[PDB]
Amino acid sequence: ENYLDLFSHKNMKLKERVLIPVKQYPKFNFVGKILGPQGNTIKRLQEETGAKISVLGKGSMRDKAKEEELRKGGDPKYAHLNMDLHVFIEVFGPPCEAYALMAHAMCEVKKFLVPDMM
Template sequence: MLDITRDRPIKIAVRVQVPVRDHPKFNFVGKLLGPKGNSLKRLQEETMCKMAVLGKGSMRDRKKEEELRLSGDPRYAHLSEDLHVEISTYTAPAEAHARIAYALAEVRRFLVPVSTNTVNNSAMTRLALRKGIKFSRFGSTTVSVEP
């Protein structure tokens, strides 16, 4: 039950399933994290929610992931679950629900397994600009020029 009259901060956390069973060959973790983890960082700043990619397949090193999963440590219990994104926020009830709704809509864009999409293109554009590379797109061809 929520007490919305006092505006006391509440923590809301939701888990969003990543559709790896429907699309086993698609790299959802790479798409969510983006170059150097910048996509997820930007998404967290934009939505004002904390996000974490958790579950089986969330770690780069598969052997280490298996080792940690079998260790029985409660910190790594998520490695026994399906791949998911945990979204959480801590604020007043109305604001918390609005933030979660916005975050869900934004994360959904990253869970569409299309190889040529605006999410990937914009992330690569930002990385290129950060590295000082000028480029332009002509159809599907990318022309790169070093400064």
């Protein structure tokens, strides 16, 4: 119901939208740093954590033109381009595995979004 059953055949899902903190770090280029050259960082990042991890929202493609054009076209896949710029973490698994994965991805992503942490 609201309960987790450990013996359920369904996986659980955890999803989180973490805001990229552009307000706190107005000039830091998060989107570049996270994606990496040709998207290698976020590829690696996904591979290391076992989570699906996406940069979404206004600024996510760093091509004000292309972004404008895709929104204007009305296509629902690009609907996210209107939202605040954010990292979207999605994991699935049995409860223990899912929380572990979310925790792993959450903590790796924190490292990117709080870039002057000690």
